Amino acid sequence: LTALRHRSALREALQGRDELSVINILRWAGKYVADPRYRSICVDVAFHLID
Amino acid sequence: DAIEVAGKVDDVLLTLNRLTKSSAQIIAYNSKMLATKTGKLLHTYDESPQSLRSVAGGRAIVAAAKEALHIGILKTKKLASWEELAYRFVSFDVPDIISTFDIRPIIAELQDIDVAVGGARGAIYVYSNLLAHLHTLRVGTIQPRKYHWHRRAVHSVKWSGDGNYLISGGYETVLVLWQLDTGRVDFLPHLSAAIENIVVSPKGSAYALHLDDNSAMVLSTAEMKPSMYVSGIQSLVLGDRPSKDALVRRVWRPIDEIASPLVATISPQNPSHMFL
Amino acid sequence: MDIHRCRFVRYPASAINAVAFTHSALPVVSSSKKYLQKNIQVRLAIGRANGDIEIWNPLNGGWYQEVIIPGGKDRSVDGLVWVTDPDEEMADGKIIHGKSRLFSIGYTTTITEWDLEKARAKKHASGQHGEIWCFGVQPLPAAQNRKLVAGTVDGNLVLYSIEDGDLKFQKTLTRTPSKKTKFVSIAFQSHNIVIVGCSNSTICAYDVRTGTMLRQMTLGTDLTGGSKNIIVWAVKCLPNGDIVSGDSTGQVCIWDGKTYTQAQRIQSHTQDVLCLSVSADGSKIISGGMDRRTAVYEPMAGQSGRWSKVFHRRYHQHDVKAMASFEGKGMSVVVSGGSDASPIVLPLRALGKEFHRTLPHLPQHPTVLSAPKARYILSWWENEIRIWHLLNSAQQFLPLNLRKNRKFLAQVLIKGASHITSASISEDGTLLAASTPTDVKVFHLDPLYIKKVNMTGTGLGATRVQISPDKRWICWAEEGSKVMISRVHATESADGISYTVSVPHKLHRLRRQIPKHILLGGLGSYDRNVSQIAFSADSRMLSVADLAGYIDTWVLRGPAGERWARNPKAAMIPKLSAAPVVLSFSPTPRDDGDYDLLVVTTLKQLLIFNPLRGMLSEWSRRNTYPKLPEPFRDTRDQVKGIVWQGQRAWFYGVASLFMFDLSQDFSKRKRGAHESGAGSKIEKHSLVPQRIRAASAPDGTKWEDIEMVDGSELQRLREENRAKWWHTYQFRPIMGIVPIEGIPPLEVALIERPLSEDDLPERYFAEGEWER
Amino acid sequence: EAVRLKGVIAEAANYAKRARRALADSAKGKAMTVHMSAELPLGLKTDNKISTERVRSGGEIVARSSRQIGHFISKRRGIYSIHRISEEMLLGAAGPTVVQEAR
Amino acid sequence: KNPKDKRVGSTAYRVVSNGGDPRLAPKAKKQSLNLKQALLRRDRVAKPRGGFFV
RNA sequence: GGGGGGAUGUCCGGGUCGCCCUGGGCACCUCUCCCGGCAGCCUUCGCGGGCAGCCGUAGUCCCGGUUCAUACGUCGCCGC
């Protein structure tokens, strides 16, 4: 996910999904916003999923 | 070019000089003709001219407009006197903005030429036979073979030796080789920088690359390792010839600029070296 | 005019599996010999995956879909082959052209021969073998003794005989030793040499007379994925003898003709090449794969027998399963049908010089019908009829209520296995009639409650059905060409109205004067089957019209002593220049008791008839074809239908929408340009150079231009006998425009069908060939 | 409390601004998807007008054809809509009135 | 379809059946139609079908 | 976006009462110049300059509704 923020493609990685895999990436984002060692990347993924 | 004036082959120079900004004219000179600074005028063409190349000998010369291409065959055989140095020219529009071209001669006569025009949209158009298509008012339908792999503009296209392969290189840092007898394509993909210029050796063995990060590597074929590597200072340059993919209005148009100074230290314990 | 756009009619797209022209190529003649090839009937047959075999007409670039013959449920069409005899000559020098018979396979052991005159299947032949997967007709060197060769699943090349109106399983040439060899494609190199592709990586070359084997060409593994056996999906033969074969690796191999070894491997596609096509003079190869990719190859200059890919392009939206070429009468096209139901016509000799053309996937008949007094819209496909009711106006809605506005009212399922060829509904929607090619069924409706009115006397099916506006006459087209009619008696009771349909009283059509060689040659009596059946607005006058251009009308003579008589003025109504694409009466009555029968043909010839007078109206004396507007003359889409207003007639093609005020009179695409049978000349972006200029005078002031080439007395009377027109292209995939009520105001239901990826089948990708 | 109200009120204000733009263009007749009722939609998404430019390979910018603009508008319609053509349109002056089913 | 056969134990009495295909077309063999597809999708898998849906 | 006008539709004091207008609210078409972009053609080595410019929005005869992706050299097991 840091490589997908550095190469400008996180929106492209998230934009083609379906319902179950959106739930899967949301479940990862919810489970792993807690660690402040990747809070930034995890919050950015949650931004793109909300948008 | 080395042409035969009477029986003495010598150098003729073919200059491409502007007369207006989007027009230019091509003008030939001998050495003694260059000493008196009068030139034999050959063509004036009027669509932002880029470059001029000629085949071995001086029979066919190829001039390049932005969208068009001017093929010229010399009118008489054997070139009896100097005052009859005249070229018949036929112009036709290439489908894309011409970045480069390489011509190979099909031969001690000159039977045909094969033109490979690398355009600024990414494609390489191979016009297979030209003198037998424009030798004959009316012409038959000519249709180039399109080879599209590069995303950005293709910086250099060259035929390779025997004529089986079409080697090429663009912004994507990959030397590509069109197989051209099959449909296949094989490539040396991850160089340091953009393949800005290629040449082929007099024999078929070596290629020599001018890489965009101020470098030249003489590669050998199918060992594909640089048998000669030469590197320069690689700092930021305000380029003279601007860019080959700044022609077609991309998302970020490449600008010749220096925004910040170069970050460099001469290193103590070894003051001949410079980290930058 | 108020419009309800409607996209909820899920009309099913079906995958095209077989495209087959009548003649592969015609002999080139001059302009002084133009009258020799005028009666040559060139037709294109396209067979879809739902078993629909439907004939097209190229029409010198018109591309009019004439007949659709649907197969039943669980029935597909895989291969199509026309068998065209050579030109026979009479005693006097007249020319009888070749009778062309259409054969098909349906993933069975049975080869079917189709009767395009009766619009049903003519014959069946089957032998004890596996399912036939590929077949072809033996080419001409004998004259009257031509034979079909068919490969199959279990191996054995069966050989069928066709002579004197026969199709029978003659014998079996050979079969492979390995039982796991499946024959997938077949093409003839000469009169006696058959080239078959197989599933076990081989291209075998059998010899038909003795049934022997010349040579077994082979191909390697596929080293791109698993599944070591390569599969040669399409073989074809060049005119100089070489064999071109597209296979499972997406390659195109050029095999030598004399030695039967390969001469070239051209890696072209990523997924497998599914179909090939070869130009008639042997100069261009078109390859269509499963990566929705079409690639065009021309020979490399210099060395002989060496081909190379000029250019490729993705014309379709799914795989390119079938294509076939045609080159004659100033028209070199190649028609490629795939799985997105859209036949794409490419120009062959001007490829890279003219745009292609995507023919409509929706049928030519509108297949959308409405009872406007009941506001029922109605559409039919495979065996169901879907009827929607709309419950409200449009003036009421000037968005939470638009979902409740439409209502999926009824879905009528037809028994049996046949398919609904046509239907019709009464103006109040209580009478519906649907025609299969086996039976003509009639249903009575009560606002639902549906009952089946017992039909008697029919039982041979029909292709067109119309119900009278006073709900008294039911007129159908039995076996395509025999127009029949029946009175229906409506007897009221204490429960309601009930319908008894009488015995069908066949009315006879006029004996037209057609020469014997035209009636023998061509497709035969194919253009007799009536395409349109149109009643008047008060049902005192019938008219029918066929594909040849003939319009035959009938009047009603009353006293149940009502009976239909032929119009005395019927012979004055002439044969049109082309097939009538729409034909209907004016609902606004005249002042002399006469009708105004509007006809538009496939050549944009809008005209109006006074059929009781037997002549054209004075409005159509005034407004000829050169007086029509340019956005109606240059549409390239066939006018699918009309809807009426008072003084205005609205036309709809597939993409266009027009209105003409028929009261007033009338006063970009090049007209002088001569192009091929697909699209106009290109303008901006092309591989082919446009402006070639030569240069004398080395100062460059003198250039050249090298061209690249391989009623003036009538109108005085017609004006001494003495605007409002509009067009739009914003309703793009129109399948049907139908009027509703509830210059007068009129609501209308425009029904579109844009094809989606949810409608098209699933694309298939392995690990290596994923798309961007 | 000011933080919570800041976030909510800023998002509602930005949606109201862009929805005012889209409703002005739909009143002009460019036929975009707008929400009808007075509650906020679930996704605070407005349809923008289609840009005049297209990004071709490899990164270049060309003009959008009106053909492709019409294709994207045909995507932007729904499954049911009432599209009233006026006599002023048939004369050639004004534009239509579209009322589409709320998706 | 066809009425199924009735066996006494030794012999089998069966109604003949050819009333399915009068003049229309012969019904496609589903085992052969699925075989040609299985030669077309050898090891390859479908892309995910639609949009946002269960 | 503003500066401004001609014209569409409208209520509140209204007016001899009609053409509408002034005072308030205004949404749209059209004109006008500056704002951001894009191209051509002259000038100069370039820098810049000059000339007549188009676009900032909507649906097409067919049709760019396309073309475009980064190799080989060798695989397996276990240990630190």
UniProtKB/TrEMBL annotation, chain A:
Listed name of the protein: U3 small nucleolar RNA-associated protein 15 C-terminal domain-containing protein
Q: Which domain of life is it from?
A: Eukaryota
Species, as recorded: Chaetomium thermophilum (strain DSM 1495 / CBS 144.50 / IMI 039719)
Subcellular location(s) of the protein: Nucleus, Nucleolus
TrEMBL record, chain B:
Q: Where are the WD repeats?
A: 147-188
Location of this chain's protein in the cell: Nucleus, Nucleolus
List all membrane-crossing ranges.
none
Name of the protein described by the UniProt record: Uncharacterized protein
Record organism: Chaetomium thermophilum (strain DSM 1495 / CBS 144.50 / IMI 039719) (Thermochaetoides thermophila)
Q: What are the top taxonomic ranks of the organism?
A: Eukaryota, Fungi, Dikarya, Ascomycota, Pezizomycotina
Which portion of the complete protein is shown here? Answer: 193 to 480 of 960
TrEMBL record, chain C:
In which residue ranges is the amino acid composition biased (Basic and acidic residues)? 713-722
Q: Name one GO molecular function term.
A: RNA binding
What is the name of the protein in this document? Uncharacterized protein
Top-level taxon in the UniProt lineage = Eukaryota
- Is Transferase among this UniProt entry's keywords? no
WD repeat spans: 266-298
List the GO biological process terms.
Answer: maturation of SSU-rRNA from tricistronic rRNA transcript (SSU-rRNA, 5.8S rRNA, LSU-rRNA)
| Listed GO CC annotations | 90S preribosome; small-subunit processome; t-UTP complex
- Please verify whether the record's keywords include Translocase: no
**What keywords would UniProt list here?**
WD repeat
Do you know which InterPro entries this protein is assigned to?
Answer: PQQ_b-propeller_rpt (IPR018391), Quinoprotein_ADH-like_sf (IPR011047), UTP4 (IPR046351), WD40/YVTN_repeat-like_dom_sf (IPR015943), WD40_rpt (IPR001680)
What organism is recorded for this protein? Chaetomium thermophilum (strain DSM 1495 / CBS 144.50 / IMI 039719) (Thermochaetoides thermophila)
From TrEMBL, chain E:
Task: From the UniProt record, list the coiled-coil ranges.
Answer: none
The lineage's top-level taxon is Eukaryota
Q: What is this protein called?
A: Uncharacterized protein
Q: Which organism is it from?
A: Chaetomium thermophilum (strain DSM 1495 / CBS 144.50 / IMI 039719)
- Give the fragment's position in the full-length protein: 308 to 361 of 364
